Structure formats: structure tokens, C-alpha cells
């Protein structure tokens, strides 16, 4: 009995509604500053001529295009190649090192189609075991005091969460790599979401510290993409929630106009 | 209690499954990358000095401060066409709620950023149903043509489960790797490898950024990228089926070589 009906096609309107109006709030956040950028790196070339005569428009596109070319590719060393691993099995995939050889590619693909199942067993042990460690410690005290007290329990699992997980992480990030309050917790999201953009890379900047930091960042990942993944979870299941909601109020406002025009 | 004895035995002993893959994977990439690093990290100085020596211009110490100020404008790809015209911001939250994320272009605005961030929180979730209904719907496709083809083999239960899935994968491959990789070679100028490279990169959502399917704005006929929407949409699907089966014969070998170890360990060859 086909009654089956697509549910998607709704859903899918909303995403495609909800890219539209996240490509006009980010044309509107950064075309312009684009704009700024594309005229003061004009005015540097120019400069960079005049300035320097004794290097042409001729010599200084090769220069240009060599270095382009250099953007293709200290890397690959003992701990590098050890974190592109890991960009590939939890898929944050940060891109700043890449394989360019057709073999590293070909055993990117298998690293990856093989790594990517095997760490999600691992994250979902760690998320498992995170989990009842909060175990240990919301139910318990929380029971001091049906759905209200809930609500109580959520905001101490977030409000924690975000300061273990994201607030000192970010702090120490801030410190450590150099970055703004606002970079540092822009990188902390890109990178629990598996986003990964590669526009900050908490291993970049060719080499400041040692053996207290990276351990520490990556058992960070291990844990904080738990943390994320649950918290993704309940984001969807609020959203569940208020879809239900809203479309009860839609009916709602139905009945009375119906009921009112009745009149 | 009693198990969570034992479920922490599990995850220490898969940690450490994992570390020993990572190592063993660090040790293939370097072993396989860093040569030709060596090799054009030797030739890029060959350059610089034939550059410094053939005219050591009283910027010869000046340099590498160029070098700076187009390495970050390389991060913007500047071009000594918007990178945030209608259409690439459209491509970019995509890359956004699909964790995709290949970077090649993202916000340095602090507004751009922080919109990002919630944009990321919410977003995520929300496709996150899409490709579960896209998932859900494609799956009962496969439902009503697996029914054609698996009656045809029961002209002669626990064994047909196998053919069912093999034509899964075949079709899978076909119709959301070969097909749209061949694509990607014809129009995007992409090797053979490279395509296949970008799709697996791209429907895992790792999304490293090397290889994007519009990237250069060459000239990108009109319903190019509505169609590449579309793969990933169902590709990403595709993928998600296909990781959780992998899951499952990993779990299978998993258990069946940890009883094999054992096995091995008590006879020991009658000793
Ligand atoms: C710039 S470099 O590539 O040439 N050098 C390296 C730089 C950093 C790291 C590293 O371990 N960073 C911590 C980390 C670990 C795993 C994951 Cl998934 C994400 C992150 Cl941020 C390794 C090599
Ligand atoms: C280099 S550019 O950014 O400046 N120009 C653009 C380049 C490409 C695209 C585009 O549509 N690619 C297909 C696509 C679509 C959605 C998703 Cl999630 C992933 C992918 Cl690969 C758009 C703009
Ligand atoms: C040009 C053909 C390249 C073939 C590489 C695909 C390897 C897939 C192996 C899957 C093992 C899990
Ligand atoms: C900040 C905006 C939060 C609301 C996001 C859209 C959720 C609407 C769901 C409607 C389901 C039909
Ligand atoms: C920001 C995404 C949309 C914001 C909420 C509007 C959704 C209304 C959907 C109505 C479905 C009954
Ligand atoms: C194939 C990559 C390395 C994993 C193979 C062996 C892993 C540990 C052996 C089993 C331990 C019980
Ligand atoms: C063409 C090879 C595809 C492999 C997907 C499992
Ligand atoms: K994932
Ligand atoms: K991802
Ligand atoms: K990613
Ligand atoms: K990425
Ligand atoms: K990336």
C-alpha cells in the first residue's frame, strides 16, 4: 500500500531554502571585504613595480606563476604524515597537506574507505563511554533537584560541555597558535563538525612547542567529535521537535481562519 | 557494572587498533609523499637562487616578504570573477551543512565567521534528515528492482543476501563513481585518477579541497553544477550505506580473527 508519500520533498525545499538564505547573509559578510582585498592587492603589485623597477611586469609574472605552482606542495615528516591519517579517518580532512602522488592517492582512497568505518567504532566506544561517565555524574546530583527538570539537566550538559570542550580548548589555542578569541573557537567548530576547512590548522606555523601539545589536541579531537556528534544529535532532535510544533500551529492558524470565515 | 568492564576493554583494545593504523598509515604517506617533496624542495630553491643570482635586486632580502603577502593571498586565490558572487556562496554553505568542507574558499570576516559557526550548528542537523530521507527513498528503489532480479535467482535465502549486495555495489560504483568521474575528466580536464580521487575524497566528506568539481571557473556549462548537486546529494548517500557495510565486515573479520587468535593460541600447532 504505496501510501508511503515522499516526506523528503518537504525537507528537501527546506535545505534548498535554507542554502539560499546562507548564500545571500554570506555574499552580503564577505564579498566586500573581497572587493577591499582584490583593490589592495593591486595596489601592491604596483607598488611592488615602481618600488622595485628592476623586476618588469614580464619577471614578475613568472615569479607569480612559480609560486602558484610551488602553492601545490618539513611535510610528510615522522608526525605529519601521522595527522594527514587523521584528517582522513575522522574525514576533518583540513586539506593543508594532500597526497599528489597517483600511489598516495590510490592508498588514500583504500586508507580512507577502510580508516573512516574503524575510527567511527572507536569514536562511538569513546562517545559511549563519555557518555556514561556523564552518567556518573548528571543523574546523580541532578536528581536533587518529568520534562522540567530535564530541561535543567541539558543546559548543565551543554554549559560543561562547551567549557571542557570548547572553551578551554579554545583559550589554550589562543594562547599557543596565535590566534583571536573569535579564531580559535571559529577553529574549534570547523574542526569537531568535521568541517575542516584547513583555513586553521592548530599544526601549522612551522614548529613551536613539543610533546605536551599535539598529544593533548589530538586525544582533544578524539574526544571533542563525540562531544559534537551528541550535541549535532540534539540539535536534530530539536529541530524534529519544533517541525512538529510548527506544523501543529499551522493547522492552528487554519482552523480559525477557516472557523472564522465561516462568518 | 559488570559490562562496563568489559565495554571499556573494548574501546582501549580499538584505540590502540586505531593508533597502529594511523601508524602504519603515516608510514606508507611519508614513505610515498616525501620524496617528491625532497625533490621539488630542492628544485624551488634552485629557482629562488636562480632568481636572487640573476638579478639580487636590493630586495633580494625582500623576498620571502612577497612571498608572504601572496601565500595569504593565496588563501583568498587572488588573482594578480567573485569567489562570493550568488552562486559560489550557494556552493559554500553546501560545503558547510555537508561537513564537506573543502576550504578552497571560506570567510575572514568575523561576521562571516560567526554566521559560519551557527550556520555549521544548525545546518549540519538539518541535511542531516535530508540525506536520511534521500537515503531512505533511494534504499526502496533498490528495494523494488531488488525484488525483479532476486526472483529470477530463486529459480533453483542465506545466499542470495550476498548476490543482492554485490549488484548494490556494482550499480553503486557505476551510477555514483564511474559515471559522474568520467564527467569530471571530460569537463573539469581531470585525469582518470583525479576524478575517482575527488569522488571518494567528496562523498566520504573529508573534502580535502585539492579537487573541486568547479573550482576553476572555466566555463562551466549551464546545468553543470545543478547536476553535481544532485550526485551529492545521493552520493553522499551512497557513501553512507557503503561506509556502514565496511563497518559491519571489519566487525565480521573483527570477531572472526579475535576467535582465530585464540584458536591460534590454544593449539599452537599441538604446542
Ligand atoms: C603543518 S604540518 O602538516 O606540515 N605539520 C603537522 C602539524 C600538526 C600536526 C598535528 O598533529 N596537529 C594536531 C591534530 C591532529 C590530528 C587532527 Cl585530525 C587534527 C589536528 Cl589539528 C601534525 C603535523
Ligand atoms: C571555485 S569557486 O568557489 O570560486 N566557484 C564555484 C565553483 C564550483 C561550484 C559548484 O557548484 N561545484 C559543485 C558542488 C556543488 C555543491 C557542493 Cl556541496 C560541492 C560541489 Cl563540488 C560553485 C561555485
Ligand atoms: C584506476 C583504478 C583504480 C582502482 C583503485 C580502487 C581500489 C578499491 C579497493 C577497495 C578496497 C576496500
Ligand atoms: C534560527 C532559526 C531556527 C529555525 C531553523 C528552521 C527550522 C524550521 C523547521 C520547520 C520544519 C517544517
Ligand atoms: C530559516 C528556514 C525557514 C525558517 C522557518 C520557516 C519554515 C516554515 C516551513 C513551513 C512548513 C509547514
Ligand atoms: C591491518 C592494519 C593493522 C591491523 C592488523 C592487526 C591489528 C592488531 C592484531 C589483532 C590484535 C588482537
Ligand atoms: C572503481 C572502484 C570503486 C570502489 C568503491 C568501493
Ligand atoms: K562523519
Ligand atoms: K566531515
Ligand atoms: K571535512
Ligand atoms: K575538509
Ligand atoms: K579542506
Redesign the interface.
Known amino acids: 500500500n504505496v501510501m508511503?508519500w515522499?516526506?523528503?520533498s518537504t525537507?528537501?525545499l527546506?535545505?534548498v531554502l535554507?542554502?539560499?538564505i546562507?548564500?545571500?547573509?554570506?555574499?552580503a559578510?564577505?564579498?566586500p571585504?573581497?572587493i577591499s582585498?582584490?583593490t589592495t592587492?593591486?595596489i601592491?603589485?604596483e607598488k611592488?613595480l615602481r618600488?622595485?623597477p628592476?623586476?618588469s611586469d614580464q619577471?614578475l609574472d613568472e615569479?607569480?606563476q612559480?609560486?602558484?605552482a610551488?602553492?601545490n606542495?618539513?611535510?610528510?615528516?615522522?608526525?605529519?604524515?601521522?595527522f594527514?591519517?587523521?584528517?582522513?579517518?575522522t574525514?576533518?580532512?583540513?586539506?593543508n597537506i594532500?597526497?599528489?602522488?597517483?600511489?598516495?592517492?590510490?592508498?588514500?582512497?583504500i586508507?580512507?574507505?577502510?580508516?573512516?568505518?574503524?575510527?567511527?567504532?572507536?569514536l562511538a566506544?569513546?562517545g559511549?563511554?563519555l557518555g556514561?561517565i556523564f552518567g556518573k555524574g548528571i543523574a546523580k546530583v541532578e536528581d536533587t533537584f518529568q520534562t522540567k527538570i530535564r530541561i535543567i539537566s541539558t543546559i548543565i550538559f551543554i554549559l560543561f560541555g562547551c567549557v571542557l570542550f570548547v572553551a578551554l580548548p579554545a583559550v589554550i589555542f589562543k594562547h599557543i597558535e596565535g590566534w583571536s578569541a573569535?579564531?580559535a573557537?571559529?577553529f574549534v567548530?570547523?574542526t569537531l563538525?568535521?568541517?575542516?576547512?584547513?583555513?586553521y590548522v592548530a599544526g601549522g606555523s612551522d614548529i613551536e612547542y613539543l610533546d605536551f601539545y599535539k598529544p593533548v589536541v589530538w586525544f582533544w579531537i578524539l574526544v571533542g567529535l563525540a562531544y559534537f556528534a551528541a550535541v549535532?544529535?540534539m540539535?536534530?532532535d530539536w529541530?524534529?521537535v519544533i517541525a512538529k510544533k510548527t506544523k501543529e500551529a499551522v493547522g492552528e492558524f487554519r482552523a480559525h481562519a477557516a472557523e472564522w470565515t465561516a462568518n
Open positions: 508511503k515522499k516526506t523528503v525537507i528537501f527546506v535545505v535554507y542554502l539560499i546562507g548564500a545571500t547573509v554570506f555574499k559578510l564577505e564579498q571585504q573581497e582585498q582584490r592587492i593591486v601592491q603589485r611592488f618600488a622595485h628592476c623586476v619577471e615569479l607569480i612559480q609560486i602558484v610551488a602553492d606542495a618539513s611535510h610528510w615528516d615522522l608526525g605529519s604524515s601521522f594527514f591519517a587523521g584528517t582522513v579517518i574525514t576533518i580532512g583540513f586539506g594532500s597526497p599528489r602522488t597517483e600511489g598516495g592517492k590510490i592508498f588514500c582512497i586508507y580512507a574507505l577502510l580508516g573512516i568505518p574503524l575510527f567511527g567504532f572507536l566506544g569513546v559511549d563511554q556514561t573569535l579564531d573557537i571559529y567548530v570547523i563538525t568535521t568541517i575542516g576547512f584547513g583555513d549535532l544529535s540539535i536534530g529541530l524534529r
